[PDB]
């Protein structure tokens, strides 16, 4: 007898109402897997009689230990997330509301919830899997029209290299920004406000540009802003048509209790 897998899903909602009230012959578990993308919010609706261990009592993924942590709140790993656990009577029947509010800046997370009906026989189970994670890892130099500068933002957004508790594997912690090198134009590399960003990533980007002599560059300032440690570099007139890519590794930077950074990979295109 194999553990049977069922799957339900709605529009940005996980409805387990009147779906967990029967008894199969073998062990079964109905799954509701969701992946929020464009700041969407999720609702989890199930019958009140069911025992629900969600939100504050969920199983969250810990990238530091590469496993899951039992009986923990998800706000302890994605603080910008905020929810509400209320009691509503949906479709006449008394239901349980598990409404989560996902901001745009909310850090990536990966947790599951157990919806178990109280019975002496535990053959039926319900599970909701939440996978908040960035899916765009390859963008270009965002030319700011106001300041006439190119920006490769790794301090936030999709290319965020900030230590996050998101479910990313070893060969998935690769974000990259591509800056088509325009001569004599300012280029910004916004990085998270971290202690080691200036201590190791700044020497890392310096050594990448000095080895190639034909690359005409000039570091102007390292400006600390509100949240971004912007590296201000202007590339001068280049001679040979070349191509360069530099790696600013923060994937190994550990952050308690589970957060891990990303490896920045800026690709420079020298074309006339």
């Amino acid at each position: 007898g194999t553990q049977d897998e069922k799957s339900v899903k709605n529009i940005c909602v996980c409805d387990f109402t009147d779906k967990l009230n029967f008894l199969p012959l073998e062990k079964t578990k109905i799954l509701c897997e969701l992946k929020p993308q464009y700041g969407e919010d999720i609702k989890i609706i199930a019958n009140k009689e069911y025992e629900i261990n969600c939100m504050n009592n969920s199983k969250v993924f810990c990238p530091l230990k590469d496993t899951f942590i039992n009986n923990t709140n998800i706000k302890l790993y994605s603080p910008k997330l905020h929810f509400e656990i209320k009691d509503i009577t949906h479709k006449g029947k008394n239901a349980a509301l598990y409404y989560l509010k996902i901001d745009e800046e909310a850090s990536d997370i990966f947790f599951s919830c157990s919806i178990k009906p109280k019975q002496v026989s535990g053959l039926l189970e319900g599970e909701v899997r939440v996978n908040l994670k960035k899916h765009i890892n390859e963008e270009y130099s965002i030319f700011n029209e106001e300041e006439d500068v190119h920006v490769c933002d790794f301090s936030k957004g999709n290319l965020d290299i900030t230590p996050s508790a998101g479910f990313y594997l070893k060969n998935s912690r690769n974000v990259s920004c591509i800056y088509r090198v325009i001569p004599n134009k300012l280029f910004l590399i916004k990085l998270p406000k971290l202690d080691i960003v200036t201590e190791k990533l700044l020497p890392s980007i310096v050594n990448c540009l000095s080895e190639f002599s034909f690359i005409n560059f000039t570091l102007k300032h390292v400006q600390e802003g509100d949240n971004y440690i912007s590296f201000n570099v202007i590339f001068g007139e280049f001679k040979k048509h070349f191509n360069l890519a530099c790696s600013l590794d923060l994937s190994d930077f550990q952050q308690e209790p589970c957060n891990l950074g990303k490896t920045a990979n800026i690709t420079f295109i020298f074309s006339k």
Epitope: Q3, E5, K29, L31, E33, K59, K65, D66, T67, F68, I69, N70, S112, E127, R129, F167, L169, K170, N171, S172
Partner: nanobody, 124 residues
Framework: QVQLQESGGGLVQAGGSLRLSCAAS????????MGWFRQAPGKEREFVAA????????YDADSVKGRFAISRDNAKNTVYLQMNSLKPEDTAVYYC?????????????????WGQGTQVTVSS
């Protein structure tokens, strides 16, 4: 959604070695955690070994501590089980299992998708 298939099983002598393999299909392999189980004919299904998502954390049982080592290859979409110094009571069908959520449990509860299982018999 993921399916599994075991291979490399058969017959072996005591103290030998077997390279058990389990390939997968469907959903991304590197996003699920793998683990081997076995069921001796008559006895129940017991835990053997387990490998994490990236492959850093290995979880083993007492009966096969040191002797059996589990390894995974995310690139090949395949998990392996290197069996060394097979005692004669290892005669069992060895099952391959995948778990979407995995908290290091030593039971079959977290594993959702299962394989078929190959026969491993050791004489002495």
């Amino acid at each position: 959604q993921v399916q599994l298939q075991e291979s490399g099983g058969g017959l072996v002598q005591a103290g030998g070695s077997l390279r058990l393999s389990c390939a997968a299909s469907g959903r991304t392999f590197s996003s699920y955690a793998m683990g081997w189980f076995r069921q001796a004919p008559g006895k129940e299904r017991e835990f053997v070994a387990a490998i994490s998502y990236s492959g850093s954390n290995t979880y083993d049982a007492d009966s096969v501590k040191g002797r059996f080592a589990i390894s995974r290859d995310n690139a090949k979409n395949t998990v392996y089980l290197q069996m060394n110094s097979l005692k004669p009571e290892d005669t069992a069908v060895y099952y391959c299992a995948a778990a979407g959520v995995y908290s290091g449990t030593y039971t079959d509860t977290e594993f959702d998708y299962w394989g078929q299982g190959t026969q491993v018999t050791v004489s002495s």
